[PDB]
């Protein structure tokens, strides 16, 4: 009963990222079904997932060989532990993410959640210093307006104020560079790194575009500058490819980049949302043998990492993540996307002659659109004003699923877009962006 | 095919809690599929699984209405988002896991691991009383050996110093009583609670156990008195059920207790592990609307909990918890496990008189047996010495699989655990002390 849905999602769920007022005045999508590039909502209309249902989903709702891999997997075992035991399918797709990631990379620690996987990187740089003999590092460097997730630990090393500024008290404290947006940016960095090189655990950045600041990309050279500073002051570099990794920049992982193999950085690779293709909640986190290598000894030295929850290494959710990079191998996907974001970006280049379009930028399917209330200012649309959401309502009136960030339009569609779907979706956004009240 | 897995385990995963260096040399299981409350190696070999997967089984590893439910999700829809959207399978889960709590708690927010449902806990607790407009509240009280997981909130709210004491300046600090373990220890509490009220955000508690510390048990009374309080002193009180919820003290969760139902606590509930019968990663924390309300207002305000990550609400994890729950009410499963329960404390009694067991103590199907180099003085054996780890060798060789903490051998069987399963279990325990070397 419609209605009744409609009713008990108000009632009894306190919505992720979600003024729950506005929600419950509003008719939201609710979901029953997928196919292929589509949700399907509870009245049957089919919206494109333009997003990608959050950055997550590559080759759409309705991918056999992934639903395939996990019915097939449950047949067996759903779950059984990583904690002193082994399960075959963990122990498989560890094998592959090592052979697929950079070759410095060689050891595979899980988790559920991209913001889990970092909380696990700050751990093992904080606790490789110490082990290592180190003294006093206990800060760690970053950028204003960067993202890693919104547990404390993740919340920390981020630097997005407007989610996470009023929790301060209990983060714990470090150096936040002016936003990567060679340049003055990077030698800012550069300058920060050598000047608290010796009182830092980590340096972390995402791969190579901000997702959360509005997809906003890092300077071409900038995380190499970065990585090799890391290299030259002895400071662990962690790499958050939590949304950028697995094919979304029009590269495998963003780290799949000569010149940071030559500095085999990052030391440590956090990887997670399209890891599954979408369909379940795995992340990993890669590190060279030199930092597992520390964690080594006798049992009743302590040495171990004492970190793991219950489902680490989860059967089911490596069996998804399995039966992606099989697509991945199967259909040379990375290849086969390349006409695809050409033709993305031929179309968004329309967009910048409208009134109200700020700018449009990204890397690959990572695009944004800034809405701006006036192009020679740059003078943005308040925050109360819901900009974003404003185009977000006239897109999903021509069936289309987009959510904004702010004055952001965030465009971070499947692998498996069609050049059809590519070409209405730029055409839908011009026609959107005119008739929203901006 | 096997020499190769366990080579490729050993060589790619950095396995949680565990000193790789150990694990490298010894033989492991590697576990291939599951029948009934039986973990099968990739030998072949049948293993009782007697911790449940790290105290989530509830129903064995072959249940039918769980696997079936998690395919035929999988057929609609794996994954859609819960930002700004709903999605079937969550509105249904949320429903009734509001009616099969106590009746104050009316709202669900949904995490992956019970981790992450201590820092939403943690993180609405501090900024319900940031918009409710007190100052200064930035403290928690928690109990010494308490244990919430492994990221940075959790661990600055747990009390496990072996585990993550190393991580101290990175933690957020506030004041541990002495373990609850007897009215001496709760009038400490109840001091400290009335002693720093203005200057806390929450006073945390596991749900009638300490599982990590070694299954002790709180007093009966304590955490009623602690609640208590909480309400007289205006402090948030947080439960932790991660791992007791789901009928593992013989209740259906700890919380379901008169006298805390009729102090309107706790306030905020934490739930996790056995809420999918241990098949897929889900976690909730449940609120008061009164916690819940704080958050509400227009969008531009930005009093919204800016906190969720991807896999919020996933699709394929509620339906498993949909499956479990059925299962509760359709088979009486409370009801039911009460005569196993009293068999098992039986069967127990026995261990008792052996020379190596300092103590045998728990609630229902959650249980330690503490093991000592001296009944007279009580004296532990040094962590290097593993003893856990000696009788869970023994234990193995007679086809049951348990994970000790130290030297507390931990027995937590799935509720699915047959009497015949439980005697034979007692009965191998007593003759596995004997055997090993102690
Ligand atoms: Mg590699
Ligand atoms: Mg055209
Ligand atoms: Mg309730």
């Not at 995402?206 to 290299?231: F, H, L, N, R, T």
């Not at 949302?273 to 597992?292: F, H, N």
């Not at 199967?330 to 290849?335: C, G, L, M, R, T």
């Amino acid at each position: 009963d419609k209605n009744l849905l409609e009713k008990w999602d108000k009632e009894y769920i306190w919505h992720p990222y979600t003024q729950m007022k506005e929600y419950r005045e509003s008719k939201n999508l609710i979901i029953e079904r997928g196919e292929g590039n589509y949700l399907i909502d509870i009245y049957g209309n089919k919206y494109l997932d333009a997003v990608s249902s959050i950055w997550c989903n590559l080759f759409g709702h309705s991918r056999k060989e992934i639903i395939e891999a996990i019915k097939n997997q449950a047949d067996k075992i759903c779950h059984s532990t990583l904690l002193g035991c082994g399960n075959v399918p963990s122990i498989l797709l560890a094998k592959k993410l090592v052979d697929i990631t950079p070759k410095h990379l060689t050891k595979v620690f899980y988790s559920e959640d991209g913001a889990e996987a970092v909380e696990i990187a700050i751990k093992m740089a904080y606790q490789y210093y110490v082990l290592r003999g180190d003294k006093g590092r206990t800060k760690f460097i970053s950028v204003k307006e960067g993202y890693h997730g919104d547990t404390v630990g993740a919340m920390s090393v981020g630097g997005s104020e407007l989610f996470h500024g009023v929790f301060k008290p209990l983060l714990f404290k470090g150096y936040h560079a002016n936003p990567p947006y060679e340049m003055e940016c990077l030698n800012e960095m550069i300058s920060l790194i050598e000047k608290h090189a010796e009182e830092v655990f980590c340096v972390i950045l995402e791969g190579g575009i901000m997702g959360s600041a509005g997809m906003i990309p890092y300077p071409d050279g900038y995380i190499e500058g970065v990585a090799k500073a890391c290299k030259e002051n002895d400071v662990i570099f962690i790499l958050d490819e939590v949304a950028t990794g697995f094919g979304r920049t029009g590269k495998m992982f963003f780290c799949d980049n000569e010149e940071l193999k030559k500095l085999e950085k990052p030391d440590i690779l956090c990887l997670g949302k399209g890891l599954t293709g979408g369909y379940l909640p795995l992340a990993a986190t890669l590190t060279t043998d030199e930092i597992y290598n520390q964690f080594l000894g006798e049992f009743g030295e302590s040495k171990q990492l004492y970190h793991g929850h219950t489902y680490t290494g989860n059967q089911l959710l490596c069996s998804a993540a399995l039966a992606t990079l099989e697509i991945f191998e199967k259909e040379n996907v990375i290849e086969n996307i390349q006409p695809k974001i050409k033709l993305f970006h031929k179309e968004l280049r329309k967009l910048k002659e409208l009134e109200h379009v700020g700018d449009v930028r990204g890397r690959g399917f990572m695009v944004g659109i800034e809405l701006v209330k006036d192009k020679e200012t740059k003078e943005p649309y308040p925050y109360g004003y819901k900009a974003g959401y404003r185009v977000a309502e006239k897109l999903l009136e021509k069936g289309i699923y987009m959510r904004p960030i702010g004055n952001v339009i965030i465009l971070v569609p499947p692998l498996s877009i069609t050049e059809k779907e590519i070409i209405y979706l730029c055409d839908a956004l011009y026609e959107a962006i005119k008739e929203a009240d901006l």
